[PDB]
DNA sequence: AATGTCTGCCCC
DNA sequence: ATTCTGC
DNA sequence: GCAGAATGGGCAGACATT
């Protein structure tokens, strides 16, 4: 019986200890108890093994269900470049839970907020038993629905799933739909669990499988080294081809060793991009890079654009998360011939799409870029022009450059691509170890309409192998410096019940500034990050007394989300941000810059408490206005 | 045909 | 995006 | 330091409601 399933079992046998029979379809309950055993622990190595045992049983018993069970545990619908989206939020879900249990929607919504988890409500308030491949297909059916009355058809499905739920199945069905699985295990741990499963239990064995455990013959050391090697093979390929629809069929048929022979990097298929770690100062840069030469580049404030040009001429563009944006930039696609030399037959560029004002010939804020149409755009309709700032070249004329140094990669980019003012230009750079010019260059970057600087090594560990290290670059933003960014003292006026980790306490707060004209507290932004788990408990201590049943007449929030608990304006907090913006919902400083829009904070985070200030002495709305203008 | 609300492997 | 935390 | 999971503002689409 799948209820007694225990994948965290010792001496787990993929066949004997499995809770379904060969060929049969993987029960969803077996995928839930696995989630139970993984949620039950915190050492990732323990989670990976438990999930590895489940995958092994799938490979030996129900090969076809391997791909569904993977996505189910990743909580994804498929390759990110396809775009399948549930379209279900807490609203559609909560309504689905209410109708499935006849309860009142408001009663359900309350318990969900209180307990900080939708799945715990869905199961306590509760047909063939659900199957993994079936529960996944339904999830796909949900995301495919469109048009009028589609929201109704979605709830019907979600209800049918909760009606057939058993034991803990409902808990994770609900959490999957809301997008907050939170097992303590995600992409990197799933890939590790997969490489471990296909190595210990190879696929493609005549049943019954002769080789159930391939590591038994090895020593404990040889087994660990062998799993790390096999692990890297998988993760390196995935970073080039993050597409399980392509890998699993190759894996089940040709095994993991042959994988880099069938699934290889190539234009048209998006790849994991190189990310960046934050640095706190110019000194820290030279401390992490030690003696290796590096370069500094502007950090343009736009949207990453991974441009692919396949053999023949087809052009695709992908976002930072492998999302397909080709249809969004029909103007870029028309200028590809203008940026590549006639000898270039294919390539993969790493650029930053930035809003460009062709009248003034200057970069426009990230906000202007956000007003571009996103789907099926006609080139003539375009209103916000975009300028591409190229900073890397990952593929050129059939050759991959992942395993090449940045010096060569940047040299090939500059020699095989043509610059054009206000369309395609190479990122402003500066090769220097001099500690003085860097500080000058960072200051100069902000003056040129950028966030700050990107720092990258040129030869020493300067490859593009996300598998070996995903955060190889360094981002140096002015607001990272402890004493340079813009800090504000804001008033805590409301609290939001937290979810997951924050369940049972405040996970976010509503902050306000002081408008000395009307003598009212104006909400300016919410706050959710910056405080430790300890600091966040003390905030639940000091704020419990200031709780109110009704808001105060001199607190104006307008379109901001109503806090679950109103608070008596008393506590003042220091808050830091990267910039200020015009807000469509916040009332803070409304009328001082824009007629209809107030001012909010981009990337606010808690710093420390300001016991030395009272609400009246908090940052005034007039001050907020002066700050916004200071950005020019 | 406006207006209002929710959603997003959204973008940052 | 920023930030924190167990490993 | 990796991996994971808390949380932010704000936009265009999509869909519900009037
Ligand atoms: O803050 P963050 O880690 O998301 O920053 C990384 C993003 O910064 C963008 N960007 C802008 N300019 C560059 C250069 N010159 N090099 C690398 N990245 C750059 C990217 O869109 C990246 O996702």
Author numbering: 262 to 387, 396 to 901
What does the report in the manuscript say about this coordinate set?
The resulting nick is then sealed by DNA ligase 1 (LIG1) to finalize synthesis of the DNA strand. The interface formed between LIG1, Mg2+, and the DNA substrate is critical for ensuring that DNA nicks containing damaged or mutagenic ends are not sealed, thereby promoting high-fidelity DNA ligation. Mutation of two highly conserved Mg2+-binding glutamic acid residues in LIG1 that form this interface to alanines reduces enzyme accuracy but does not impact enzymatic turnover, thereby facilitating mutagenic ligation. Overall, the DNA ligase structure adopts a closed, catalytically competent conformation poised for DNA nick sealing (step 3) and is characterized by DNA ligase DBD–AdD–OBD domain encirclement of the DNA substrate.
As a significant (~20%) fraction of the insC4 substrate remains unligated by the Cdc9EE/AA protein, even at our highest enzyme concentrations, variable conformations in annealing of the 3′ bulge may also impact ligation efficiency. Together, these results reveal that single-nucleotide bulges positioned 4 nt upstream of a DNA nick normally confound ligation by yeast and human LIG1 homologs, but low-fidelity Cdc9 and LIG1 variants efficiently circumvent this guard against abortive and mutagenic ligation. In principle, as insC4 has 4 C nucleotides that could be paired in variable registers with the 3 G nucleotides of the opposite strand, the bulge could be accommodated in any of three registers within the ligase active site. However, comparison of difference omit Fo–Fc electron density for the upstream 3′-OH DNA strand reveals that a significant distortion in the DNA backbone path is observed for the insC4 sequence between the −3 and −4 positions relative to the DNA nick, indicating that the bulge is accommodated in a specific register. In a control mutant LIG1EE/AA unbulged DNA complex structure, a prominent pocket created by the engineered EE/AA mutant is found at the DBD–AdD interface. It is this cavity which houses the bulged nucleotide in the insC4 complex. Notably, electron density for the budged nucleobase is less well defined than the backbone phosphates, indicating flexibility of the flipped nucleobase which is positioned near Pro341 and His337 in the EE/AA pocket. We conclude that structural plasticity imparted by the cavity created by deleting the HiFi metal and its ligands likely facilitates dynamic binding and flipping of the first C of the four cytosines. Biochemical studies of Cdc9 and a LIG1 X-ray structure with insC4 show how the mutant enzyme accommodates a bulged insC substrate by exploiting the engineered cavity created by deleting the high-fidelity metal-binding site in the enzyme.
